[PDB]
Design a protein around this ligand. Structure first.
Ligand SMILES: CSC[C@H]1O[C@@H](n2cnc3c(N)ncnc32)[C@H](O)[C@@H]1O
Lengths: 236, 236
C-alpha cells in the first residue's frame, strides 16, 4: 500500500462480532479459503482482511495461518465479546488485552508453568505500539475501558467455580474468552504483531448464556467501534 | 483408477518416524512456512508432505491449515504415541481412531454436550476408507491393534483421578492425548479426509518400565513402516 499502510487481518469468532466492520469496509471483495469467507477492503489508511473464524482455539488459529500465508497480513487483531471476571468491570465495558494467557492449559507434568503450552511462553505480549494507541482511545472515551490480562480457554465460562479457578491461577485476569490467546499464540509463532480487544457480554455467572444472548449484538458492536477508532489512529 | 495420485500431508509426532519417512521420499525438498519446516516428495503412487507435529490445539490447527492451503494436501494423517486408558490394551498395540472427541471443552451452558465445541459435532469422524485400510495393514502385518475413540485436550493429564473422570465422561475412550481432535476438527473444516493413529506407550495400569521418550525410538520406526504399507495400499 502507500507509505506505512498495513494489511491487517481481523478475526471475529461470530457474525455479531464482524457485521459492523463489514458495514465499514470500502472496496470490499469476498474470498473463499478453506471453506471460510474472507473479506478484503480498505478502512481509513489501511487494508483489512476480515473473517468470521468460528468459535474456539482451532477455528481462530486456522484463520491466523491463512491470514498470514494467503493474505500476507502484517498484523492480527481479534475483536468480540467476553465474560467479565474482574471487580469493577460491567457488561458493555471494553478490555483491551496487553497480554493473553491460557487458563485451561496444564502441561505442569512436563515442568511448564500452569497455563503455559509446551514450546511457548506463558504470556503472549500484545504489540506495545498497538496497546499504547488503544490505551489512548479508551482514555479519550472517558468511561470504564481497561487495559490488562485476558485469559482464554476452549470453554464458555459460566459459574462461580470456574471464575474462582481462573482467578486463583491468574489473579489479575480481567475477562475470559475462547480465542484471544489462541490467536496470540498463532500470530506470535508467525512473527506478526497482534492485539485483542473485547467488550463484555456477561459476567460468566452460572446463567451467563442467558446474559450473553441478551448482549452479544451490543458487545460485538462496541468492540468493533473501539477497534475502528484504533485503525483511524494507527499512522502510516 | 479414480482420483489418481493424492497429495497427502503426514503430521508425525515421533522424530524417528519422520526421519524414516523422509529417508524414503523421492525428490525430497525442504520448505519453511510460518517458521516451520515441511518436506515434500513422492512415495509409491502418492505425493507426500511431511512435517513434525507441534503440541496442542493451536499448532495442530495451523499445521492442517498450511498443509491444505499452501501445500494443497488432499488428506491428513496424524501419527504418534500415547498411553492407553482402556484396560485391555498392551504396550505397542496400535489404536486406529475412528472418532475423536475433546475431553476439555465445556460450552454446556448453551446446551451443548460436554466436550462439544460450539458450532461442531461432539465427535469427529476419521475417513472410513482410511480406517478400514489401516485396520487391514495391522491385520496383514499381524500387528495387534484396535479401532476406536481417542480423546484430546490442551493438557497432559497425569493424575489418575482426572483420567477416571474422562473415562466416566466418554465410556469407550481408548487413549487420551493433545492433538488428535484438533487435527480432526481442522481437517474436517477444510473438507479433507483424515485419520489419527497412536501406538500405546504404556498400559492403563502403567506397567511400562521404559519411558515415553525411549518407547518412541523403536515405535517411531514401527509406525513409519506401517504407514508406508498403508500408503502402498491406498489406491489411485
Ligand atoms: C458461543 S461460545 C462463546 C463465544 O463468545 C466469547 N465469550 C463471550 N462471553 C464468554 C464467556 N463468559 N466465556 C467464554 N467465552 C466467552 C467466546 O470467545 C466465544 O467466541
Amino acid at each position: 500500500g502507500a507509505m506505512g499502510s498495513m494489511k491487517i487481518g481481523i478475526i471475529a469468532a461470530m457474525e455479531e462480532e464482524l457485521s459492523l466492520l463489514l458495514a465499514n469496509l470500502l472496496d470490499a471483495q469476498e474470498h473463499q479459503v478453506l471453506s471460510k469467507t474472507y473479506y478484503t477492503g480498505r478502512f481509513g489508511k489501511h487494508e483489512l482482511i476480515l473473517v468470521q473464524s468460528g468459535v474456539g482455539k482451532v477455528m481462530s488459529a486456522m484463520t491466523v495461518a491463512i491470514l498470514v500465508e494467503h493474505f500476507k497480513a502484517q498484523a492480527i487483531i481479534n475483536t468480540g465479546s467476553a465474560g467479565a471476571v474482574a471487580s469493577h468491570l460491567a457488561i458493555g465495558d471494553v478490555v483491551v488485552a496487553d497480554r493473553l494467557v491460557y487458563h485451561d492449559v496444564d502441561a505442569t507434568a512436563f515442568g511448564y508453568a500452569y497455563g503455559q503450552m509446551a514450546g511457548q511462553p506463558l504470556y503472549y505480549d500484545c504489540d506495545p505500539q498497538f496497546v499504547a494507541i488503544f490505551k489512548q482511545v479508551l482514555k479519550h472515551e472517558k468511561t470504564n475501558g481497561q487495559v490488562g490480562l485476558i485469559a482464554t480457554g476452549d470453554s464458555f465460562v459460566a459459574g462461580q467455580d470456574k471464575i474462582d479457578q481462573i482467578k486463583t491461577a491468574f489473579s489479575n485476569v480481567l475477562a475470559v474468552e475462547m480465542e484471544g490467546a489462541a490467536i496470540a499464540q498463532a500470530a506470535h509463532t508467525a512473527g506478526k504483531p497482534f492485539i485483542v480487544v473485547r467488550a463484555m457480554s456477561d459476567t460468566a455467572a452460572h446463567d451467563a448464556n442467558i446474559t450473553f444472548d441478551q448482549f452479544i449484538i451490543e458487545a460485538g458492536k462496541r468492540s468493533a467501534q473501539i477497534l475502528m477508532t484504533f485503525l483511524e489512529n494507527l499512522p502510516v
